[PDB]
Design goal:
part of a larger assembly, 2 chains, mainly alpha, Glutamate receptor 2 (chain A), Voltage-dependent calcium channel gamma-3 subunit (chain B)
Chain lengths: ~50, ~40
């Protein structure tokens, strides 16, 4: 009766996302997508400006 | 991360720090063209 009561309150998500992140030190979801680098960026051809 | 980062009016006025330094700098050379023609004149 208590395990289901924590899920409907959503406490377990706070109980989950605490220890997977506070023990981390790494950035999660850093990659995401590659659409923002679809074109040539500056630094890919910035040496021609140099 | 698919960012949405954008620039402010310190950057866009920094663009004016370039262009005004160009249109003034070409204006002084036209003096220097003149002020050494009336040196030779």
């Amino acid at each position: 009766l208590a395990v289901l009561k924590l899920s409907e309150q959503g406490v377990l998500d706070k109980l989950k996302n605490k220890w997977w992140y506070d023990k981390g030190e790494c950035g999660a979801k850093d990659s995401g997508s590659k659409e923002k680098t679809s074109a040539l960026s500056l630094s890919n051809v910035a040496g021609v400006f140099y | 991360k698919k960012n949405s980062y954008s620039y402010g009016w310190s950057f866009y006025f920094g663009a004016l720090s370039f262009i005004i330094a160009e249109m003034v700098g070409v204006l002084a050379v036209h003096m220097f063209i003149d002020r050494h023609k009336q040196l030779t004149g």
